[PDB]
């Protein structure tokens, strides 16, 4: 078995470049930031599929 | 250490000052709610010439809020322009166009 | 302190728990340069009023 892929997921590369320290309610989270909208997420939860 | 104005303005010529200065880049920033302290911190000698003349690279760490800190200094390219020897044994850079 | 879940989930009507919360406002900002760390806080059980 290998689950397919599900409706709404965006592809994206995995690249250092995507990944860095920022502010988000006093710590120093990971932050992603999806390279479509380019909008930064600092916690794991939230993000976009 | 700290070099007194007194031995600046009095030592014979010839002599060699070690001086040393702080950069502050990296310094913390202080808590939004602590307290000011009181006094002022003050530096009476200065270097007339850049003093960094010797450096590579400077803040190697990220800053939180903005892309890249201020004054980060990358490595220049040539440090890592591994270049090609030459037939004659001289060095050289890597060619920066063809022919 | 903390409660779990399970007995609030368990316990008999009656029972007078007591939760705790941080009044976040007062917290210490992170060090610029600081590296962030693993883990996310989480908070399971609210009030319904004030």
Same mark, same amino acid.
């Given at each position: 078995?290998?689950?397919?892929?599900?409706?709404?997921?965006?592809?994206?590369?995995?690249?250092?470049?995507?990944?860095?320290?920022?502010?988000?309610?006093?710590?120093?989270?990971?932050?992603?930031?999806?390279?479509?909208?380019?909008?930064?997420?600092?916690?794991?939860?939230?993000?976009?599929? | +250490?700290?070099? @007194?104005?007194?031995?600046?303005?009095?030592?014979?010529?010839?002599? &060699?000052?070690? =001086?040393?200065?702080? @950069?502050? &880049? &990296?310094? %913390? #920033? %202080? !808590?939004?709610? @602590?307290? %000011?302290? !009181?006094? #002022?911190?003050?530096? =009476?000698?200065?270097?007339? +010439?850049?003093?960094?003349?010797?450096?590579?690279? /400077?803040?190697?760490?990220?800053?939180? #809020?903005? @892309? /890249?800190? /201020?004054?980060?200094?990358?490595? !220049?390219?040539? #440090?890592?322009?591994?270049?090609? =020897? !030459?037939?004659?044994?001289? &060095? =050289?850079?890597?060619?920066?166009?063809?022919?």
């Amino acid at each position: 078995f290998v689950p397919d892929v599900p409706e709404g997921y965006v592809a994206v590369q995995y690249a250092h470049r995507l990944f860095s320290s920022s502010l988000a309610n006093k710590r120093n989270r990971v932050t992603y930031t999806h390279p479509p909208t380019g909008m930064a997420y600092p916690s794991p939860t939230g993000r976009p599929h | +250490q700290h070099v @007194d104005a007194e031995s600046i303005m009095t030592a014979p010529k010839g002599k &060699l000052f070690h =001086l040393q200065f702080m @950069d502050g &880049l &990296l310094r %913390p #920033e %202080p !808590s939004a709610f @602590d307290p %000011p302290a !009181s006094g #002022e911190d003050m530096r =009476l000698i200065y270097p007339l +010439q850049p003093i960094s003349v010797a450096r590579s690279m /400077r803040a190697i760490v990220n800053h939180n #809020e903005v @892309d /890249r800190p /201020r004054g980060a200094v990358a490595p !220049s390219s040539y #440090e890592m322009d591994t270049g090609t =020897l !030459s037939r004659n044994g001289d &060095l =050289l850079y890597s060619p920066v166009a063809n022919g």
